[PDB]
Amino acid sequence: ERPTLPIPDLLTTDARNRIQLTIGAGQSTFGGKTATTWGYNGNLLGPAVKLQRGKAVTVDIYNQLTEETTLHWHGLEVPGEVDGGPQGIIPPGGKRSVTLNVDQPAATCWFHPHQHGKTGRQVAMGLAGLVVIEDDEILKLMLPKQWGIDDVPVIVQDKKFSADGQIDYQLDVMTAAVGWFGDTLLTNGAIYPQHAAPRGWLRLRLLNGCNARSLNFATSDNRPLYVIASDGGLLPEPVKVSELPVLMGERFEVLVEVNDNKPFDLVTLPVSQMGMAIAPFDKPHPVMRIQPIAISASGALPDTLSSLPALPSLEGLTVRKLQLSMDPMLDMMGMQMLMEKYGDQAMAGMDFHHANKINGQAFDMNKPMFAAAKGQYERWVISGVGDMMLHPFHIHGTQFRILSENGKPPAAHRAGWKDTVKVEGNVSEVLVKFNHDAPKEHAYMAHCHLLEHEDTGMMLGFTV
Ligand SMILES: [Cu+2]
Ligand SMILES: [Cu+2]
Ligand SMILES: [Cu+2]
Ligand SMILES: [Cu+2]
Question: Which residues of the sequence carry a binding annotation for Cu cation 2?
Answer without folding.
Answer: 74, 112, 449
